[PDB]
Ligand binder design. Structure first.
Ligand SMILES: NC(=O)C1=CN([C@@H]2O[C@H](COP(=O)(O)OP(=O)(O)OC[C@H]3O[C@@H](n4cnc5c(N)ncnc54)[C@H](OP(=O)(O)O)[C@@H]3O)[C@@H](O)[C@H]2O)C=CC1
Ligand SMILES: NC(=O)C1=CN([C@@H]2O[C@H](COP(=O)(O)OP(=O)(O)OC[C@H]3O[C@@H](n4cnc5c(N)ncnc54)[C@H](OP(=O)(O)O)[C@@H]3O)[C@@H](O)[C@H]2O)C=CC1
Ligand SMILES: CC1(C)N=C(N)N=C(N)N1c1ccc(Cl)cc1
Ligand SMILES: CC1(C)N=C(N)N=C(N)N1c1ccc(Cl)cc1
Lengths: 542, 547
């Protein structure tokens, strides 16, 4: 006994909005939200011109029909009063459509206009006079679903009339000039229930999310239940971790966005992690073994559910490449990532009494460029001492790309004790095929709340660097987690974070001129179109 | 289209079978097939007496009902009889002896309609709420009168015999108890032409025996969010780059399966993934391989020893190798004198010279595994030198951390000594091991840089599973998960036909591994301290059909 039209006639909306350039601030924005993506059109045309991928989506969604499911619909459409779908649109829009493709192939075409006269058009192409008019027309017709493909004005009113069931919203992650925008969706009316994978098309990233109106053969089916007869009736920390804490996170239907690979792990550890001791005093929840994969050819996996800064980690990466072990080099650039591990107190607890403060010992950088060399102090000359692994893996990539020995290992067993701290990131393995570079990095200890996000970005950038100086395109960054833990003092922050819906990922642009791994400088890196949620202090006590 | 009794009334059979105590005439090498599992009962009772997990499964299957589907089922059955316009239960049918084998406190089976076949007894002879029938046909008449979800034939042999004989069974829920017991009753030999295995469950351990659940099938002769799934998969290319070299009909059995939950499928699926999507690359002297990058397999060592069953595997070799590793040895002669040739090819004059190790004695493998495990950092001289207290004894170290600082996130064993690589006859394929300890249980992750799925991987999995057991035992812990990480995973083309065959074999429940409980030091193990039990396996497959 549903008294709602949009729900009976299956009236959906579908669009694609890009970011709009604020004459006040410019491209680099200070705050974001769903209303960030609102650019609809410009000069009677699309802000971008052609988005080969979004186009394929538009078509696929509006031309898709499931005939074996139709009767159920008609049964109720007639009760309330070659199958195809219905595509409503405003005059202006219908006009911006190129002749050869108009009217839309395999669609029901209906133009909501008051100047257009039935005659001018053929029986096929319909023409309505107003909102209410449509509804009736849908009665005297046979269709699967009805899609409002624009324009702005049509969207605007239809949202007021509350005649929209769902909104297929495409987020174009780039800025363009616009003159017409999509209505600010009221989060009390419509809410995101699905977010797709992230892609790159026409030199820009984009994704697809779904807005849903807030309501406020068989033999093998039982065999599935049988095989589950021994499944857990409950979760370890299910109690300690409440449910109304993740209603949004758990309200989503399809979470294909890559960021969920990180978020889902957070969830698993909060719901099933093992409670353990920790020298730091506080406790943690830990699990053993996880995998995340990012397609660097489609996006740069910099988290968006919170804010992340990259200057620090890029400088750290350049510091590694130079083979330095001098913490002062980072402190003088205000990169305090290693400061705690280079203090008098920290070095002494490691029993390195004869080590100068900030002399981190034979860590990463030294192992990458001098594995095997005898470590004296951070100021010594190590030219041509030890094994230059970095150089070697680059030559392997260039001259023997099919090798299965392209590894960069920082876990020098003989030098662990001499290190301020043993490496968390154990090694890197590279793989090359059809001019593409993928990288696997094994991490023995992973702090999901604070370190992992930076760890992801760090190696993604590194894969980009190695690829460029080898004339390859980055492909996959595979992150293998050993001990994965969440600090108890981060649980509250992570709960907030798991309920934030990801924005399409940004992209990484490297100065194309740099051709040798050793020539990169801080200015040679640029993160573009990074749309993100607000900063979150994992440690809320400060 | 006519209707078939078994389908209209949904008549299923559920059983449990073990391995019989049949004679072996002294032939160590026993042959295996499904008929291997056929022990129903003995002396009026179960061959094994009791098995919690299987019984829990039996109760789960025979009492589960989905009242939603009945509406549809009432339609069918009614339309079949030509008739058409309170808690739904299943029907269990059983023979006289089966009924008498049930313990009084469990009679009649709870939440189920109990039907008993008999001639020597009538309703007057029963106190319980049950139905008696003196002939099969009566069951059909009765089913037509009752309101039930599904009908299950739960034995005994005589009963299974007639129901399969009369072609009344739609599917068979078969439990394979992987152990041997004295028996005097057997389940009928299932005809491969009538029934085909369509699902294989995960493997488990219960009452000192592993077991799995398989389903045989009778062979021939919010809904809107569903549309959204279609949309999001709009960018899918329904193509596979190697389907042309690997035809569909070559994986009939493999693809026919519905549920592939047996742990062995983690291996098989990777193989299948590489054959259908691998990358074509070169090798040593034009040899071809298909490869992918980055895989992961997980094995619950508390429930089974993951020794592949779709082909025969011997472990004497990889065990000796492991003890050789633990002893820190680099002398290939030691293995050869035990008729273990795993390292033979890598220690020849020709091989060593090709590696530029001109001054290395034949079979002196150099600073490999063993050495790095007990002396990482020490200068390698020759396989006969004494390296006592030289280099870092990683093995000893990781054992102390597991014992005294179990929460440490530094318990790693690494054989990839960047400085010694060139001095090694061959660089290590198994780069490292990380251990994890929680609640008295030990888990292990092993990263392998290069993986030969056809030959190597099967042995690699067994090697590290055994090592996890050994380490867990000398540390007073219980083995848990062996997690295998694959970097460069490849399949040699010379192996494709052999693997296509293997992919079409159904896995048997895994065996178990037994270690002499007295060995408490990682260094005190000997070949006679390792025992594999109940290894049911397919025929050995020679990967290379050109030898
Ligand atoms: N990214 C996206 O998803 C979309 C982008 N666009 C872009 O935006 C631009 C067009 O949008 P827009 O300016 O809003 O124009 P519209 O396409 O929405 O058409 C508006 C016109 O349609 C008729 N109309 C609308 N509502 C009613 C009503 N209630 N009753 C009677 N007639 C009505 C009237 O035409 P009249 O009375 O004169 O006959 C009106 O002037 C183009 O540049 C196009 O490329 C358009 C749709 C979607
Ligand atoms: N592992 C497993 O899954 C199972 C094991 N078992 C075991 O097997 C043994 C019992 O099997 P089994 O010896 O074959 O005995 P059954 O359970 O099959 O019972 C056979 C008897 O039931 C009656 N019966 C069977 N068919 C008919 C028919 N068509 N018409 C009339 N009466 C019929 C007759 O008894 P009557 O003399 O009264 O006329 C007959 O002698 C026990 O050891 C038990 O523990 C049993 C079921 C399953
Ligand atoms: C192709 C495009 C931009 N993309 C989406 N996701 N939704 C629409 N309604 N579109 C659209 C189609 C036709 C016209 Cl005239 C205007 C916009
Ligand atoms: C418990 C057991 C062995 N287990 C399974 N999977 N199938 C049966 N039919 N069983 C069974 C049920 C009732 C009786 Cl009387 C005998 C055996």
């Amino acid at each position: 006994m549903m008294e709602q039209v949009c729900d009976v006639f299956d009236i959906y909306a579908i669009c694609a909005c890009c970011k709009v350039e604020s004459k006040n601030e410019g491209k680099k924005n200070e705050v974001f939200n769903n209303y960030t993506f609102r650019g609809l059109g410009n000069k009677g045309v699309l802000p971008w011109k052609c988005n080969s991928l979004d186009m394929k989506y538009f078509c696929a969604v509006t031309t898709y029909v499931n005939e074996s499911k139709y009767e159920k619909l008609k049964y109720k459409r007639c009760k309330y009063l070659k199958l195809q779908n219905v595509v409503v649109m405003g005059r202006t829009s219908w006009e911006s459509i190129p002749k050869k493709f108009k009217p839309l192939s395999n669609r029901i075409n209906v133009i909501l206009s008051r100047t257009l006269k039935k005659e001018d058009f053929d029986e096929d192409v319909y023409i309505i006079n107003k909102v209410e008019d449509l509804i009736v027309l849908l009665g005297k017709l046979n269709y699967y679903k009805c899609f409002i493909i624009g324009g702005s004005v049509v969207y605007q009113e239809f949202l007021e009339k509350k005649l929209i069931k769902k909104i297929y919203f495409t987020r174009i992650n780039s800025t363009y000039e616009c003159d017409v925008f999509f209505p600010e969706i009221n989060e009390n009316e419509y809410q995101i229930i699905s977010v797709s994978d992230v892609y790159t098309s026409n030199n820009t990233t984009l994704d697809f999310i779904i807005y849903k109106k807030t309501n406020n053969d068989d033999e093998e089916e039982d065999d599935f239940v049988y095989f589950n007869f021994n499944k857990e009736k409950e979760e370890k920390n299910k109690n300690s971790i409440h449910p109304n804490d993740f209603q949004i996170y758990n309200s989503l239907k399809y979470k294909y966005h890559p960021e969920y690979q990180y978020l889902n792990i957070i969830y698993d550890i909060m719901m099933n992690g093992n409670k353990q001791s920790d020298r730091t005093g506080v406790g943690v929840l830990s699990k053993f073994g996880y995998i995340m994969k990012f397609d660097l050819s489609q996006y740069f996996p910099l988290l968006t559910t919170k804010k992340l800064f990259l200057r620090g980690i890029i400088e750290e990466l350049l510091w590694f490449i130079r083979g330095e072990t001098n913490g002062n080099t980072l402190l003088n650039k205000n990169v305090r990532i290693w400061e705690a591990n280079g203090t008098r107190e920290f070095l002494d607890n490691r029993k390195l009494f004869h080590r100068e403060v900030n002399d981190l010992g034979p860590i990463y950088g030294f192992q990458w460029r001098h594995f095997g060399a005898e470590y004296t102090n951070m100021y010594d000359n190590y030219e041509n001492k030890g094994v230059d692994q970095l150089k070697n893996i680059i030559n392997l990539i260039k001259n023997d790309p099919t090798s299965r020995r392209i590894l960069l290992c920082a876990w020098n067993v003989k030098d662990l004790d001499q290190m301020a701290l043993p490496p968390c990131h154990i090694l890197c393995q590279f793989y090359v095929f059809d001019g593409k570079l993928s990288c696997i990095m094994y991490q023995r200890s992973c702090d999901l709340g604070l370190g992992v996000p930076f760890n992801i970005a760090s190696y993604s950038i590194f894969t980009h660097m190695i690829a460029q100086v080898c004339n390859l395109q980055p492909a996959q960054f595979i992150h293998v987690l050993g001990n994965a833990h969440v600090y108890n003092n981060h649980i509250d922050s992570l709960k907030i974070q798991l309920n934030r819906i990801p924005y399409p990922f940004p992209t990484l642009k490297l100065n194309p001129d740099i051709k040798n791994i050793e020539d990169f400088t801080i200015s040679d890196f640029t993160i573009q179109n990074y749309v993100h949620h607000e900063k979150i202090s994992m440690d809320m006590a400060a």
